[PDB]
Amino acid sequence: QYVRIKNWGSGEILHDTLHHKATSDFTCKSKSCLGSIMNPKSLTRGPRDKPTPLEELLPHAIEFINQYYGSFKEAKIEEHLARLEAVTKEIETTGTYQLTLDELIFATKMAWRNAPRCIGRIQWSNLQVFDARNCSTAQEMFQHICRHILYATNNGNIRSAITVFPQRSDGKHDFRLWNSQLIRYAGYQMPDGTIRGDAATLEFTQLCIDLGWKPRYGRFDVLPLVLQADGQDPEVFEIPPDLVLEVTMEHPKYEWFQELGLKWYALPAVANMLLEVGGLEFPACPFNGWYMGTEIGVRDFCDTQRYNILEEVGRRMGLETHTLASLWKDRAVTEINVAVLHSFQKQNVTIMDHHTASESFMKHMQNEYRARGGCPADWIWLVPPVSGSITPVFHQEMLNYVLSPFYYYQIEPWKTHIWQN
Amino acid sequence: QYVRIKNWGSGEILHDTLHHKATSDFTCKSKSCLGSIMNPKSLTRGPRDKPTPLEELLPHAIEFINQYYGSFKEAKIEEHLARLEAVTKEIETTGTYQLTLDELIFATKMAWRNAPRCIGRIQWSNLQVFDARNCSTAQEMFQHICRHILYATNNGNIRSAITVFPQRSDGKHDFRLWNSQLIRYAGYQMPDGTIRGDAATLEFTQLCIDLGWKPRYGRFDVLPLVLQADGQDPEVFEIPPDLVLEVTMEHPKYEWFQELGLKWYALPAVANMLLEVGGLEFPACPFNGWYMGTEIGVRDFCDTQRYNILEEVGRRMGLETHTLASLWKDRAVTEINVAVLHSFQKQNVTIMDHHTASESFMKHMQNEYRARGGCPADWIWLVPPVSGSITPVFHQEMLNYVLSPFYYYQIEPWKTHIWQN
Numbered sequence: 001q002y003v004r005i006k007n008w009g010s011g012e013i014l015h016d017t018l019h020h021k022a023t024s025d026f027t028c029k030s031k032s033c034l035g036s037i038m039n040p041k042s043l044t045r046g047p048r049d050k051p052t053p054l055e056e057l058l059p060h061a062i063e064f065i066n067q068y069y070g071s072f073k074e075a076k077i078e079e080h081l082a083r084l085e086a087v088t089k090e091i092e093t094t095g096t097y098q099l100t101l102d103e104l105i106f107a108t109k110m111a112w113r114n115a116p117r118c119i120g121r122i123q124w125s126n127l128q129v130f131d132a133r134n135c136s137t138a139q140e141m142f143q144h145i146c147r148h149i150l151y152a153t154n155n156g157n158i159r160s161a162i163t164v165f166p167q168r169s170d171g172k173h174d175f176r177l178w179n180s181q182l183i184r185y186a187g188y189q190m191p192d193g194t195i196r197g198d199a200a201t202l203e204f205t206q207l208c209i210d211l212g213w214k215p216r217y218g219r220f221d222v223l224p225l226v227l228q229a230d231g232q233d234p235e236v237f238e239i240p241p242d243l244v245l246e247v248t249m250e251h252p253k254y255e256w257f258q259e260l261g262l263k264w265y266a267l268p269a270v271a272n273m274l275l276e277v278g279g280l281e282f283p284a285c286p287f288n289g290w291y292m293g294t295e296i297g298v299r300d301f302c303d304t305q306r307y308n309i310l311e312e313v314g315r316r317m318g319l320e321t322h323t324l325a326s327l328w329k330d331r332a333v334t335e336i337n338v339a340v341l342h343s344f345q346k347q348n349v350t351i352m353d354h355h356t357a358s359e360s361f362m363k364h365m366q367n368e369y370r371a372r373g374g375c376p377a378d379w380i381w382l383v384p385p386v387s388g389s390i391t392p393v394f395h396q397e398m399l400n401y402v403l404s405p406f407y408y409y410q411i412e413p414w415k416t417h418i419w420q421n
Numbered sequence: 422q423y424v425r426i427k428n429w430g431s432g433e434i435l436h437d438t439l440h441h442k443a444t445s446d447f448t449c450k451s452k453s454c455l456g457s458i459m460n461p462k463s464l465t466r467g468p469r470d471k472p473t474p475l476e477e478l479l480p481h482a483i484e485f486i487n488q489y490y491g492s493f494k495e496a497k498i499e500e501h502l503a504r505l506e507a508v509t510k511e512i513e514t515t516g517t518y519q520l521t522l523d524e525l526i527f528a529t530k531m532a533w534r535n536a537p538r539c540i541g542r543i544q545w546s547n548l549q550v551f552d553a554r555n556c557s558t559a560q561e562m563f564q565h566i567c568r569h570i571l572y573a574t575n576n577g578n579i580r581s582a583i584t585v586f587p588q589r590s591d592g593k594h595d596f597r598l599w600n601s602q603l604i605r606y607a608g609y610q611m612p613d614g615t616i617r618g619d620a621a622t623l624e625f626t627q628l629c630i631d632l633g634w635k636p637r638y639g640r641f642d643v644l645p646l647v648l649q650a651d652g653q654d655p656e657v658f659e660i661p662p663d664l665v666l667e668v669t670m671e672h673p674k675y676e677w678f679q680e681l682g683l684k685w686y687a688l689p690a691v692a693n694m695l696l697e698v699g700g701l702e703f704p705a706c707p708f709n710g711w712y713m714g715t716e717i718g719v720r721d722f723c724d725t726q727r728y729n730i731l732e733e734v735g736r737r738m739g740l741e742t743h744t745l746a747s748l749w750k751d752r753a754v755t756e757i758n759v760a761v762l763h764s765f766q767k768q769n770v771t772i773m774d775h776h777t778a779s780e781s782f783m784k785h786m787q788n789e790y791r792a793r794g795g796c797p798a799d800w801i802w803l804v805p806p807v808s809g810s811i812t813p814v815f816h817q818e819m820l821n822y823v824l825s826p827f828y829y830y831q832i833e834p835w836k837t838h839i840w841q842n
């Protein structure tokens with residue numbers, strides 16, 4: 001009937017029934033739980049080489065159409081009925097179908113709404129949609145992407161948006177962005193064995209170089225867009241610097257913080273995910289929202305596998321960086337977090353601290369259960385990387401399941417791509 | 422063959438094969454993951470009212486005996502063979518069997534070793550075992566428990582230990598401790614609607630009162646032991662104050678911290694879990710290790726559902742406690758954590774900071790894969806309540822599964838108990 005969920009901080013109880021609409025199997029076994037696996041197959045939608053079998057499509061298509069028309073406050077049965085037939089006939093005549101712009105907008109917001117790992121979902125209905133399903137070349141992709149970046153950046157007053165390119169037809173003509181995020185920094189393997197820049201993009205950086213991109217060997221060099229159109233080999237494109245807004249890091253008290261010469265891009269945009277909707281798959285649909293402080297101040301700056309700046313900030317604070325039990329790491333990471341938030345605020349760039357985001361998510365989840373008795377949520381991703389139990393999200397039991405529409409991961413394109421030259 | 426596991430901080434890869442020895446089903450469904458549910462049925466072993474069917478026992482018994490004898494560095498086949506027969510004959514003749522003291526010690530350490538939610542498992546082989554399987558009355562239980570508390574406290578130089586009482590025979594004569602932990606503080610519902618003390622023990626406190634315990638209405642009143650022997654109604658017993666070691670909270674800089682009049686018990690001991698081993702179940706086996714700072718400084722003191730002292734510490738620090746985005750909560754919780762660690766250190770009471778515990782666990786897991794290619798681990802419990810990604814445990818993917826021996830939870834005794842008077 002329903003799974004009981006409790007919030008140990010408040011004692012509140014919730015009944016989850018939405019999980020019944022869950023698609024096929026998830027990650028965890030029957031006698032084993034994964035949960036903490038970053039890229040499980042349950043969240044990945046791979047490549048094809050043949051259209052989607054009609055027996056599978058039509059059911060999903062009908063299903064989606066029913067969900068779409070069901071969403072209206074005042075039903076439109078004829079329109080619904082009409083759409084149902086038109087869709088069917090279209091599938092019979094073309095072996096696939098096209099969504100109406102409104103259905104697409106609906107699909108993008110719902111898929112966002114269904115992202116178990118997104119803590120900013122209270123904003124789900126507030127999303128701008130750029131329809132690029134007519135795109136056909138790498139150059140056109142590049143223009144669309146630039147328009148997106150410009151619209152979304154909005155001189156610091158960030159706006160959430162998504163650009164949808166042509167849906168996968170037969171899997172042999174996929175539109176794909178080879179980047180992780182639209183704007184990412186390069187990571188170089190220096191001569192003296194050290195790593196410069198974002199160690200996380202090392203392989204992809206090399207790939208950009210192996211494709212003719214000129215490495216500037218900086219600590220913060222914006223990587224180029226590596227676009228793939230209609231299944232063809234990817235083409236490299238530098239992002240016009242005017243479009244990339246950055247925030248210089250300053251601490252509100254430690255004047256020496258700037259001496260660290262740190263900065264970060266203001267636009268967080270996922271570039272390589274696939275949008276699944278009504279039997280259709282969109283291998284290219286870069287989207288963006290805005291940053292939550294800890295992503296930058298904690299992960300990007302303090303992960304040892306990233307810019308790893310924690311110890312240095314410790315020393316400059318004159319802490320016992322050689323005695324773990326002194327909790328210096330705890331002292332440092334906080335100042336860095338304050339730096340990030342301070343810097344974004346002073347430069348008028350949208351950002352949200354993790355405490356506020358958590359409360360926001362709790363209100364959202366709360367609304368979701370009333371609205372549809374459920375909210376797919378991955379505790380492991382929703383709980384901020386610092387101050388865990390200090391946030392309300394930590395005390396909330398959650399159910400993680402994959403609905404549809406959905407945003408899946410994809411096999412790295414360079415691992416399955418059939419090159420031409 | 423094996424599940425691949427990656428540590429994103431180091432890049433290291435591990436192959437888990439131990440999960441194959443997993444018992445029956447776990448929590449997560451096939452198309453849904455729980456993971457974040459505190460008390461799932463997969464971790465609970467309920468009450469019975471009839472002996473364990475022999476078809477189920479013998480197999481488990483043989484299994485355990487094989488694991489035990491297999492653990493020796495130099496095999497003792499005859500002894501193994503002999504034990505196998507003796508065990509069998511014992512089951513045939515009595516419908517159950519008794520473990521040798523050595524097998525029991527082995528079982529308690531292995532079950533600890535198999536606790537997915539324990540971050541201090543590197544200490545697993547270092548455990549003192551008090552054999553109370555001969556106990557028969559509440560008073561005897563009380564003596565054993567007192568001996569345990571005294572041995573374990575060791576004037577602040579904490580020692581891990583466990584006391585095992587009679588195994589469940591037919592489920593109608595269970596030995597059970599009704600407390601959560603051996604030493605826990607009382608929680609009272611005051612006249613003026615406020616809550617005093619540990620809000621988490623409110624119900625159990627009332628229960629102690631409904632059983633004749635005299636409420637001292639303090640903020641830190643040690644609850645009484647509510648012992649149940651051989652299936653009889655529980656009897657109340659106050660713990661001799663001499664046995665309860667406490668640490669007064671002092672901050673190494675904020676002299677006003679003491680003015681908060683805070684303190685905590687030095688002995689963390691789980692009182693209500695069940696030890697499952699070779700088909701046998703021990704409904705009473707209180708055990709203890711030592712504290713990890715964050716349990717006290719973050720959970721006990723800062724959980725809103727506990728002593729909820731965060732805002733007050735904020736104010737005394739003169740922080741913008743009305744602006745979440747100021748990260749004041751982050752500033753406060755750190756000082757409290759330093760207080761706890763400082764206080765335990767100055768009073769010579771064993772304690773481990775969370776950063777050190779995490780590294781320790783990583784070394785342990787690392788050893789476990791070499792030793793037996795696996796380590797059941799519940800990411801959600803192993804990652805400290807603060808400084809998440811600052812700890813190595815955060816970047817470690819993990820597999821959570823239930824082996825045997827194991828420590829299960831149990832239905833609250835007062836919900837299934839058949840009273841007599």
Ligand code: HEM
Nearest residue numbers: 112115117118119120123160161287288289290291292407
């Ligand atoms: C408006 C503000 C938004 C905020 C503050 C927000 C915040 C976040 C954060 C903190 C993460 C964690 C990222 C990481 O640790 O790697 C995340 C993940 C995610 N967000 Fe949101 N988000 C927002 C908008 C959006 C939008 C507009 C979409 C889609 C239309 C979206 C889709 C997702 C998805 C699918 C993930 C998972 C990414 C992955 O698995 O790598 N988010 N979000």
Ligand code: HEM
Nearest residue numbers: 533536538539540541544581582708709710711712713828
């Ligand atoms: C020697 C030091 C030890 C340390 C520092 C340690 C630390 C911890 C911590 C921090 C937790 C989390 C508790 C919570 O958040 O509620 C935990 C849980 C646990 N520990 Fe360990 N532990 C130690 C020894 C032991 C021993 C000796 C046993 C058993 C023989 C054990 C069994 C467990 C179990 C079963 C849990 C789960 C408790 C639950 O689910 O409520 N631990 N431990």
Ligand SMILES: C[C@H](O)[C@H](O)[C@H]1CNc2nc(N)[nH]c(=O)c2N1
Nearest residue numbers: 036037038380381815816817818
């Ligand atoms: C192993 C771990 O699953 C990965 O380390 C986790 C935890 N949660 C995360 N949470 C977010 N929000 N983003 C993340 O990168 C990761 N990684």
Ligand SMILES: C[C@H](O)[C@H](O)[C@H]1CNc2nc(N)[nH]c(=O)c2N1
Nearest residue numbers: 394395396397457458459801802
């Ligand atoms: C919902 C959540 O499962 C409970 O809040 C969690 C997370 N992890 C925990 N981790 C530990 N170590 N002890 C805990 O109490 C809890 N509770």
Ligand SMILES: C[C@H]1CN=C(N)c2sccc2O1
Nearest residue numbers: 268269270287288289290291
């Ligand atoms: C960097 C990456 C993850 N963090 C975010 N805030 C978001 S929200 C949408 C996209 C996105 O991109």
Ligand SMILES: C[C@H]1CN=C(N)c2sccc2O1
Nearest residue numbers: 689690691708709710711712
């Ligand atoms: C309070 C409870 C949980 N925290 C601990 N450190 C441990 S370790 C063994 C028992 C125990 O008791």
